[PDB]
Each structure stands twice: as C-alpha cells, then as structure tokens.
Design a protein around this ligand. Structure first.
Ligand code: AMP
Ligand code: AMP
Lengths: 122, 123
C-alpha cells in the first residue's frame, strides 16, 4: 500500500508542545504510553522535531542537568504520502529509526508512520 | 529455527537487581539503552520479573511518591530453548508481551528472547 494507507492520521497523533512543562509532558507521555512523540509549535501541521521518552531518563538521576526540550529534541524525518511501504520499511531499517512524519503535497502534516505498524502488517 | 538460535545468552543479559536504588537502575538502563530488563534476586537464574524503563517515568513527576521496584515489576514469562520461533511469535502476539526468559532442560536460565529479534529475522 502507500504510507498514507497505514499511517496514524494527524488528529490522532499524540504530541507535545515545545513550551509545556516537564509535568505537563510527563502526563501526556505516561498516559498515552507511547515511546516517541512529535513536538509541535502552534498546531499539528508544524512539527519541530521528535521527543523520545527514553531520553528523559538521564534527567531523573540525582545529579542530572536541568531538563529542557532543547536538550532532547531530535530531528523529525519527513516522507511524502505517496511513499511505498516497502521503501518506507527499508528506510526505517537502514537508517535505524522508528517513526516518520507523513506530509501532503502541500506541506501540511498528514500523519505519522512507524516501523511497528508496518511489521504488524507482514 | 528454535529460540535457542536467536536468544540473547544469559551471560550477555543486561539485568537489574530487585533491591537496587533508582540511580543505580538508571545508570544501567541509560548505559545499555534497552527498553526492558529482567529483574533478579540472587543471580541471573533467579528472575523475579521484568521491568520496562518507561514505567519509571511516573517517578519523575513533581508530586510523585518514592520509587520502589514492587510497583513497576511485571511477572516474567518462561519458555524452553527448544521452542520453535513460529510458536514463540504466536505466543508473544497472543499473550501481548515482548520479552521472555529462556530455560534449558535442567531448568537453568539460558537467556532471554524478544519479539523484536524474531521480527528482525523475518524482514
Ligand atoms: N505519538 C503517537 N501518537 C499516536 N500514535 C502513535 C504514537 N506513537 C506511536 N503510535 C502508534 O502506536 C503504536 C504503538 O507504538 P508505541 O506506542 O510506541 O508502542 C505504533 O505502532 C504507532 O502506530
Ligand atoms: N535487557 C537486555 N539485555 C540484553 N539484550 C537485550 C535486553 N533487552 C533487549 N536486548 C537486545 O537488544 C535488542 C534491542 O531491544 P531494545 O534495545 O530494548 O530496543 C533486543 O531485541 C534484544 O536482542
């Protein structure tokens, strides 16, 4: 199929805001139980990057630095809606990543796609 | 293909001790980068459960209670090394879990196996 046929659409993406407090973030993270979250600015069409929940663990150490979104924000990989699942799988595999943001022909965000959902198919 | 052929051997398992402090668990988790860890008592043949790193997050919240292994530890599922990988895949999916403890014919812990390693095999 197309990446578009297996993606989590935009409105169902569980995201974080680049300005929220750690507590507000944790609330979302803990209750959604997901591992990676797109981080947005004004809305879900403007993704600043990706936050992986495991990157929060160093901040839990008793002698850790202060947490800030900038310390954990990763670059978001974007792919077109028309990208092929085979190619999508191959790319998750060779670049060793798990989530990509799907963009429409017009620069809007269509949804996210994960290696987990592809494998569940096969 | 059997579990024995794809398991991570006991000697390479990254584990946590049931009586370890939060900092000590964090050091191990951070250094290894894994998501789940068998939790042991005396040694690696004495597996008490599995801990998922993400279950530690509620203790970072500002008004959280103090961390204790009791409230995050989950029961460990044990399988024999001769089990076929196809059956293992079906049990993981049926019982909705990601990591199992593998034992040999003497009942000793021989390793761990994960669904990610099985899926990786079938790509
Ligand atoms: N941030 C997210 N928002 C919405 N769905 C997601 C998110 N992260 C992962 N998923 C979906 O939830 C499934 C479980 O992934 P995870 O929750 O990371 O185990 C994945 O296969 C994705 O389809
Ligand atoms: N606690 C662990 N000890 C040793 N190897 C592990 C452990 N957890 C996972 N692995 C291995 O490393 C792979 C990646 O899983 P993870 O590192 O949790 O993403 C797993 O499929 C296992 O093969």
């Amino acid at each position: 199929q197309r990446v578009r046929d297996i993606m989590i659409p935009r409105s169902q993406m569980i995201t974080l805001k680049r300005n929220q407090t750690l507590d507000e973030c944790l609330d979302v993270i803990i209750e959604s139980a997901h591992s990676r979250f797109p981080v947005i600015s004004e809305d879900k069409d403007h993704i600043e990057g990706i936050l992986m929940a495991k990157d929060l663990l160093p901040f839990m150490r008793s002698d850790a630095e202060a947490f800030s979104m900038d310390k954990v924000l990763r670059t978001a990989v974007v792919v077109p809606e028309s990208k092929r699942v085979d190619r999508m799988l191959k790319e998750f595999r060779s670049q060793r990543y798990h989530m990509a943001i799907v963009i429409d022909e017009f620069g809007g965000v269509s949804g996210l796609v994960t290696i987990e959902d592809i494998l569940e198919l096969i």
